[PDB]
Symmetry: C4
Subunit: 315 residues, 4 copies
């Protein structure tokens, strides 16, 4: 038996806390949890009770989402907000869900604020990992905005609400951290996004934009002279529905086609495939690292669980 009390020397800073709140700059930020005493301990906690609490929290959240979903689905958008309830069961259910939706939003909002009270946002912006919390804050932000617009007689609230909704469904992935495979997968995802995806987009957009302006220049009208629509037409090539003959409003057919071909080859063929290639390599490079991260991710959850859960007695 290891002297676990050392870890729990929170009077200064628990060993686990040191790790959990370690700066992204720390070399062993993840590697520190390779210690057998720490793993023994954390796994014990997880199985002993934390995962139960965790699953519960997840369950609650997914309920929140379907409640919110329904509220939006049956939302009487006809007219301007706020809307007057009528004496029906459906109306009762709607406003019930509506209220609950807002409540949960406030809950997450406030928690985000708590984190800001502790880990100030000037610090949080430096942790592209803590974003997993920030996203809930943003989600709730959209909720709150829609509340304002709703009571401001601004139907625009729908849009804000919708963004909140989508955010939540994205945020569902947060809870994959409770599974040594799903959470790992999620880690793979977030890293590839932060790396390869944005790397790709940086260039993708350059070509998208460049070619769209090239084409527009040639275009006389056809409702494609509007850059907005032309760039969408080019975008369509990369989703797989780009029409080479989308317009005839030009005197330079050959040139028009040439540009399209270049765009396709460079973007649709080359870059998209390249992306895949690089992604494969990124996977190779990570692998174990995602597992390392996942363990950390879970550990953090564990600590927060105990910290927030009434300081419940334990070993």
């Amino acid at each position: 038996l290891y002297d676990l009390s050392c870890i729990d020397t929170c009077e200064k800073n628990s060993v686990l806390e040191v790790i959990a709140y370690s700066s992204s700059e720390t070399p062993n930020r993840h590697d520190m949890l390779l210690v057998e005493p720490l793993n023994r301990l954390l796994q014990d906690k997880w199985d002993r009770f934390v995962k139960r609490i965790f699953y519960f929290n997840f369950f609650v959240y997914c309920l929140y989402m379907i409640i919110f979903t329904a509220a939006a689905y049956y939302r009487p958008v006809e007219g301007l907000p706020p809307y007057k309830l009528k004496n029906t069961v459906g109306d009762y259910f709607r406003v019930t869900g509506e209220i609950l939706s807002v409540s949960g939003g406030v809950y997450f909002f406030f928690r985000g604020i708590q984190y800001f009270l502790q880990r100030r946002p000037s610090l949080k912006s430096l942790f592209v990992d803590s974003y997993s919390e920030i996203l809930f804050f943003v989600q709730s932000l959209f909720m709150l905005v829609s509340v304002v617009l709703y009571f401001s007689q601004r139907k625009e609230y729908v849009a804000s609400m919708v963004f909140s909704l989508a955010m939540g469904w994205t945020n569902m992935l947060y809870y994959t951290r409770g599974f040594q495979q799903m959470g790992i997968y999620a880690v793979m995802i977030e890293k590839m996004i932060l790396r390869d995806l944005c790397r790709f987009m940086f260039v993708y957009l350059v070509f998208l934009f460049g070619f769209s302006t090239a084409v527009v220049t040639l275009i006389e009208d056809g409702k494609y002279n509007s850059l907005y629509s032309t760039c969408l037409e080019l975008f369509k090539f990369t989703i797989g529905m780009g029409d080479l003959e989308f317009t005839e409003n030009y005197d330079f057919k050959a040139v028009f086609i040439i540009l399209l071909l270049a765009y396709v080859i460079l973007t649709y063929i080359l870059l998209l495939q390249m992306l895949i290639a690089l992604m494969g390599e990124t996977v190779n490079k990570i692998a174990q690292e995602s597992k390392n991260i996942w363990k950390l991710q879970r550990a953090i959850t564990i600590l927060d669980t105990e910290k927030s859960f009434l300081k419940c007695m334990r070993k």
Copy 2:
């Protein structure tokens, strides 16, 4: 020469049987067949006669499938079942195939039952490998259901029948196990399904659903307000036929487009490509393992062949 009689000590449990019916939990479940005596023996059996019997069984099965296929293809769906045969050759052929189809269904059904009598279904559910047998059971199940509905005057039997049909064509892959390459390939397939595919879908569906509700919320009508149709519209982006302008029923064009773009980027671009990447890695990780499994798969077939085939005399 090795003392092969040891292997054949079935009075307690044959060495090969030990392996064949080994729990999925066994560490060497597959590795046990790396023994030269076992391989010598099994390969001998295979070449000596088993593969001939196997090929025959395959042949019979593929006949079954085309018979069943034809029966369905020329099925007089006009009216309600059961249908009355007329004095024609085509009618004769139809009912002939129909009967045969049912018969083969019962055959597989019963065999599945036999397996349940031995390897109880409470055990079978724990072997995500024994599913190769279960699928035949399910196939036959659909057959039997269609029989009931047919005689119940319920045209719905067609649907059940169709599922049986499709199941069978899928189940054709069962017999790839007789080839050291096709069966191996099949192993690669089933593992990637059980791993990467379902892993992917778990998240794919989250985004699909989330975004579909987001969009529906914005939608006023256009026959897209129905979640069902909207989620299909989003699904279309991933097959390659998603229309960015599928509807105009909203007051928030910009937002509408934003959501679509997010969905595409996250799902169509990122996740689908990621999947490919991970699949490549999975292939790397397996490779030899699929071969190991294939050998086991064949060995099992061999044992069952001898066991079921009249206990035919052998070495």
Copy 3:
């Protein structure tokens, strides 16, 4: 200096000939050319003159193809063959190219026959590598067939001719063997075809067919009840233009959609991506081997060059 006369002991069998015409069963079939004396010699030959002759032959062939192409492009398909020339330059050019096309066909045909006179076709069928020659034979075969049909007053000759044409354009790749990169690439191609592609298709078609019959069964008419058209509709999903709502001729909408979804997921998503994954691994496995093969491929060409080219004096 190595005693090169040993290699040239053709009175029994040249060392290079031994290798060139080595059975596919030979373990070192390709590895034998790793000998420094052989490489020294072969590279010398290549640079000294063979590659010049080779480039010439290529040049001639590509001329043949464009001549043939033009003949077909401007072919007066109106009416029935044989067609009567009129006193015009275009007619003169057409028949000129036509004759030349046939001539070159006969040339390749005859060469194929020569190979059969030597390396009998009973042997050739065992060399899935010698197909590089066979393809020219097949190409010429189609040519000859079209000649017959042409003079038989059968417009069907066009179809045969077209196949010959396509064959030739495919056969253009033959000459990539003169470049240590293009030929290597071609080797990568042919191996992946012979391996992964046909492996894939074996299963692809199973699902294609199976699902198509499933769907047809549900279909009442709509011109999709014809299996032929339905299977094409399913095929379209894998090229990227499959319509989930291609028909409404059924009483089981839900089921109809279910089947489509299964087909997409299993075939479009899973198998196609899997194929990519496996292809990547195949590339890894080959790499050097394709280079080895390429060297052999070139060596063979070299030997044939000298053998056919007037037995021109050399070192």
Copy 4:
């Protein structure tokens, strides 16, 4: 401290210059910069001031591009050039941007000429790396051509201009060299283009062309008898919008379909996926090499910075 004055012995040739202008044939062309003294020095320069100048130059360039873009976007193509300005703010802004666009074109043109005065174009053609400069020259070339055509009353100038525009947006990637990741990515891109992409296209086009002529031969008319349109129809299969039933103008439906299927399988399925596979391997092979190259790329920029920037005093 290393004796840095040795590096600066430019009276003969600076050590860095030796490397920077090293022939592509040099074995250590890139490896030479692995020297710790060189890296120390170059990194110092970069951070000390070069990167600031570099960022500035980039900034200027991106301004140039958006100015040019706007000029084209609001270009009164109605009638024939040169166009007469009217007394409006928009006209003033247009011609302002127009002039600026030409000016920057001349700037890059002249610089290209300067390089030709030094590193003669007979040499430049041998450096498929120096193309990064050539592209600016080509960009400016198109600009100058449009100027001529503009004043020649030839509306065709638009086309030339458009090409210049697109070139510039492509050339934006030049400046990714200032980032150890973006520039590296760009290196990955250019290599894969120069290698795999053109390798692919070499064969892709063979099949594209071959099959297009095959199909045309069958075609009676339908506006597809024109090879140009048919080859586009085939091209569409690879972008994901190829229609199997694009025409009915033929007497050989079966054959028509067969050809299409072959084209799809060989090109759309096989080759495109193969390309991806090879690309993955190319990534594996490069990796570090791209980083090496990137460092060189930056070093070159550094040297040119100092050389062109007033010979500003330094260590």
